[PDB]
Amino acid sequence: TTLTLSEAAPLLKKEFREGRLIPFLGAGFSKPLKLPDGSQLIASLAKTLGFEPELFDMHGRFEQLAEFFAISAPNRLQRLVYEMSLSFDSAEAEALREKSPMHRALAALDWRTIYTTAYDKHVEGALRDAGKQAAVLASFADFQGPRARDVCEVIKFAGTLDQPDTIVLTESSYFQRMALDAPPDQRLRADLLANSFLFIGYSFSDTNIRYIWYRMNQLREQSQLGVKHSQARRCFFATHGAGLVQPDILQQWNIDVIQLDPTDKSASVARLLESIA
């Protein structure tokens, strides 16, 4: 009911040599860089607001606790972006990034489009370390702006720290993205029409991602394909700790789960990216 690493490796080679595989990277892809995930940000937001980190986490979801932080005082969200910039894109986080085996194995492949939901320059920065060049596309002016003819376009689906208006962190920013009208939303839905995705380091907890794959399956069911042909194009979801309910919800949406070895989380991902090559 769940693919292993050796079973999913020839399925990822076929989609990559056709140029129809696109990585979708999450917050967990920057964990060997000693960066906070969605839980240690809330531990840092509770320290500023005067909460205890265990008591503050019981007052709502991740989207709702950041909305409470941004309206506690004026210019409180701007300060967070400044602090995050100092800690996510620091010089010691760049030094851990050349010697990271995942970021070397990601940049060794010749991708054309990479989607990320992280606030750091460590995905396109891994491409600059391997001699390649990337193109960060986060806002409307980036898509309209000039780029080289053949460059891996890194689509910042959540925003970038150098453009603080594009960051979706609070609940009102996620509700603004429910209309699927943003330029990262329009680019994702057109690439999902024709390409397989590889989810690495991302867990389907945001309802803005789960709603896009819902309405792609709707176009699939109304097109009245057979049992054989509607199950042909799959997506892949590499996760060390997938439960029992969530892999069966995603079988509806043509998303296969790749079970990685949870003992060393960094080396299990690196062996997946080297098996595509």
Q: Which residues 28-57 are close enough to bind a copy of itself by CB under 8 A?
A: 56
Residue 90 binds ligand NAD (CB under 6 A): no
- Interacting residues with ligand NAD between 128 and 167 (CB under 6 A): 158
Residue 101 beta carbon to a copy of itself: minimum distance, rounded to whole angstroms:
26
Measured at the alpha carbon of residue 15, what is the angle toward residues 11 and 16, in degrees to the nearest 5?
110
Can you tell me which of 191, 265, 271, 275 binds a copy of itself, judged by CB under 8 A? 191
DSSP string for 52-80: -HHHHTTSS-HHHHHHHHHTSSTTHHHHH
For ligand NAD, the closer CB: 119 or 197: 119
Residue 221 beta carbon to ligand NAD: minimum distance, rounded to whole angstroms:
25
Non-local (6+) Cβ contacts of 21 within 8 A are 12, 15, 195, 196, 197, 198, 276
Can you tell me which of 43, 162, 203, 271 binds a copy of itself, judged by CB under 8 A? 162
Structure tokens belonging to residue 276: 């595509």
For a copy of itself, the closer CB: 87 or 101: 87
For a copy of itself, the closer CB: 49 or 130: 49
Alpha-carbon distance of 205 to 250, in angstroms, equals 12
Using the contact rule CB under 6 A, the part of the chain among 7-15, 47-55, 75-83, 262-270 near ligand NAD is 262-270
For a copy of itself, the closer CB: 203 or 275: 203
Alpha-carbon distance of 175 to 86, in angstroms, equals 28
Residue 234 beta carbon to ligand NAD: minimum distance, rounded to whole angstroms:
18
Residue 171 binds a copy of itself (CB under 8 A): yes
Cα 271 to Cα 3, 74, 213, 237, 264, distances in angstroms: 15, 46, 27, 15, 11
- Interacting residues with ligand NAD between 224 and 243 (CB under 6 A): 239-241
Interacting partner of 117 out of ligand NAD, a copy of itself, none (Cβ under 5 to 8 A depending on kind):
ligand NAD
Residue 81 beta carbon to ligand NAD: minimum distance, rounded to whole angstroms:
11
Which residues contact ligand NAD by CB under 6 A? 26-32, 35-38, 41, 62, 88, 117-120, 158, 201-203, 205, 239-241, 265-266, 269
